[PDB]
Ligand code: HEC
Ligand code: HEC
Ligand SMILES: [Zn+2]
């Protein structure tokens with residue numbers, strides 16, 4: 667019933683990135699530069715295959731600094747983690763949702779079984795609750 | 803004496819990212835969101851090792867659209883490529899420098915055998931001509 671810390675996620679496939687700056691509706695709490703990562707099982711789902719149990723997607727969120735017409739990555743703020751288990755995470759559409767403050771395994775963030783996470787992700791039912799699209 | 807197109811670079815290790823906005827000294831031609839990738843051999847150099855022959859670093863540059871204070875990745879503009887071969891690329895400090903327009907193997911951008919690239923990268927002699935640092 668708990669999402670595993672995704673050890674070694676930084677070596678996985680980089681799906682995409684986006685910057686959320688002040689003024690964006692989502693500045694609280696996903697303000698910053700984020701990078702999405704996918705393990706091999708998640709790549710199968712992202713390609714248009716189905717997501718096997720053990721698929722993991724990571725939302726890696728950094729603070730940034732303005733440095734002379736550059737946004738430079740600062741400290742990690744958190745990671746979001748989606749872990750596929752159709753049975754064990756059936757209450758949240760077959761994905762377990764967890765956050766780790768500063769990406770630390772000991773700073774688990776989710777208190778409601780991931781219902782809040784699932785609430786936003788539910789809009790994406792038709793793409794198996796995943797916003798991110800594989801790009802070249 | 804030509805740099806090979808780095809086929810499969812998008813499945814490599816994501817080292818780091820940075821946004822270069824309009825007004826930056828380098829806006830022509832590296833304005834946009836860039837992602838740095840390293841093959842296995844390049845990781846050895848980034849971790850504190852000697853860069854072995856066969857090390858490849860890729861600078862993957864995307865256009866972006868500012869959309870309600872989100873910076874959203876658009877089309878790939880180009881990739882920059884550094885390929886380690888101490889003998890073959892001896893004239894430019896053991897790295898071969900090349901650009902591919904839109905990341906296409908047919909669109910070679912370097913016209914001076916990489917002397918201009920080398921000219922900037924030479925400032926980083928003490929880190930084997932590599933600007934990017936491995937981060938967690
Ligand atoms: C809407 C108000 C959101 C809430 C609440 C949560 N997330 Fe989210 N998430 C959202 C968007 C619009 C995106 C796509 C970002 C992009 O660059 O395209 C995401 C992405 C993720 C990812 C990457 C996988 C994907 O679906 O694209 C993960 C792993 C993720 N989110 C986890 C997550 C968790 C654990 C949440 C509860 C703490 C959570 N999200 C809330 C929008 C929203
Ligand atoms: C200074 C005026 C530059 C010139 C001319 C070129 N590059 Fe560059 N490059 C520069 C900086 C400051 C950085 C680091 C970017 C970051 O996010 O920190 C880079 C990076 C690269 C990379 C990634 C590897 C690394 O050294 O960090 C590659 C593969 C790369 N650059 C290639 C490249 C080529 C092929 C050039 C000539 C066409 C070239 N660069 C010119 C600064 C400068
Ligand atoms: Zn200025």
Ligand SMILES: [Zn+2]
Nearest residue numbers: 687868870871
């Ligand atoms: Zn703005």
